[PDB]
Amino acid sequence: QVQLQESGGGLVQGSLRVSCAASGRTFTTYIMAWFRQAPGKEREFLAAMDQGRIQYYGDSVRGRFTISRDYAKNSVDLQLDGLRPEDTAVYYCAAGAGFWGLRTASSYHYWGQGTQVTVSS
Amino acid sequence: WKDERLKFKGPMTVLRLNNLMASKIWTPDTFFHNGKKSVAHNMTMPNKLLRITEDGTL
Amino acid sequence: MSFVKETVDKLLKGYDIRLRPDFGGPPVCVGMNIDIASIDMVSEVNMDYTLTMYFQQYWRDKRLAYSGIPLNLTLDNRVADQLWVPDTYFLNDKKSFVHGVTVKNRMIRLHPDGTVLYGLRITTTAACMMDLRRYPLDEQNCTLEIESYGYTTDDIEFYWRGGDKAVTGVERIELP
Ligand SMILES: *[C@@H]1O[C@H](CO)[C@@H](O[C@@H]2O[C@H](CO)[C@@H](O[C@@H]3O[C@H](CO)[C@@H](O)[C@H](O)[C@@H]3O)[C@H](O)[C@H]2NC(C)=O)[C@H](O)[C@H]1NC(C)=O
């Protein structure tokens, strides 16, 4: 079975780093991405990296969040700087070749359990 | 793009540059990251065109 | 922008491409970096493999040092014809070329201390003699050899810039 375990903090007053380790399959050729889901059931694209180390970002989090990949370890990391209260949400790690997508959740065939992140002021 | 060094004034509004003069100025060094082998067509004449507007827009 | 123009004119004026940096002095140390874009045609028939790379060479040239401009001068690639560049060549290559669309994929970057970065996008077929007696249960050693054509160690010295991190992109490579 293919799993995407997610690690990272959940409470910050702030900087954070959310890591995602993939097991069960080698995702060298796949586009590894991060999605956000705030309360109300809407999934938001945040960042993505492809085999060419090319970083795509959403407009809402452009220049703030940084996505990186460790191809040897088959993992993807998302560094979050400049957190605000509205960033409180569940962050999902996703992988899959981007067909009709690269910004749509439907193009990713693998998803992580998710990580809750909260910010308090 | 825009190049203020190539600003000009005259009866015309657009200046077509031949390839010899087009090669004499700065152009972006665009390249294809995932390209394996590419050909710029040169049949009959170099298949390239350069236009300069009076405001300096290339 | 003008001050940069007279600075570049000063640097290029009175520059002898025929003489290496520290021509009478100790050898010029040339650091080298490679970024492997792709390895494509691993052919058992032809005993060679095709490899695309970004190949960067770093070397200090005091003649090209400048001051008063706190930024790295990335110049148009054609200036590479006007500067001295190393004698580097791939010993085991069979067919190599610089990608030339939209322009020649070259990069010349000068630094205020006189450091010169010379980058090339090169696709090269390189010989890889394979011992396929254990085929398909076989392991191959495919090498790229880089050498100076007309200089010895007393004139030029090579090293891998960044140690073992000099060559990157191998982790991202996958072959059928
Ligand atoms: C002009 O070129 C120089 C040389 O490439 C540029 O300096 C370089 O800047 C990078 C980014 O800061 C440095 O890398 C980083 O260095 C820190 C050092 O603590 C390290 O912690 C990071 O992980 C990363 O490696 C790089 O070392 C540095 N090179 C030098 C100083 O020789 C410079 O930014 C360029 N631009 C200007 C306007 O000068």
Q: Does C16 show up as a binding residue in the annotation?
A: no
Subunits in contact with chain C (3 or more CB pairs closer than 8 Å) = A, B
Asked whether C165 lines ligand 1 (CB < 6 A), one says: no
Nearest C-alpha of chain B: how many angstroms from A53?
11
Distance between CA atoms of A112 and C157, rounded to whole angstroms?
50
SS3 content of chain C, % helix, strand, coil (to 5): 15, 40, 50
What is residue C8's three-state secondary structure?
helix
Distance between CA atoms of C18 and A114, rounded to whole angstroms?
62
> For residue B24, is it left (φ>0), alpha (ψ between -120 and 50) or beta?
alpha
Whether cis (ω within 30° of 0) applies to the bond prior to A85 is: no
Residue with tokens 């409470």: A11
The resolution, in Å, is: 2.8
Q: Is the distance from CB of A34 to CB of A68 less than 8 angstroms? A: no
CA-to-CA separations, C176 to C42, C53, C77, in angstroms, rounded: 10, 19, 36
Method: cryo-EM
What is residue C169's three-state secondary structure?
coil
Nearest to C139 by CA among C128, C126, C125, C152: C128
Q: Does C88 show up as a binding residue in the annotation?
A: yes
Nearest to C55 by CA among C92, C86, C94, C78: C86
Structure tokens at C37: 């874009």
Whether cis (ω within 30° of 0) applies to the bond prior to C7 is: no
Distance between CA atoms of C110 and C94, rounded to whole angstroms?
32
Residue type, A75: S
Distance between CA atoms of C32 and B22, rounded to whole angstroms?
34
Nearest to C49 by CA among C143, C137, C136, C133: C143
Structure tokens at C22: 């520290």
Structure tokens at C53: 């790379």
Residue type, A60: S
Residue with tokens 């891998």: C160
DSSP characters for B1-58?
A: -B-GGG---SS-SEEEEPHHHHTTS-----B-TT-S------SSS-S--EEEETTSB-
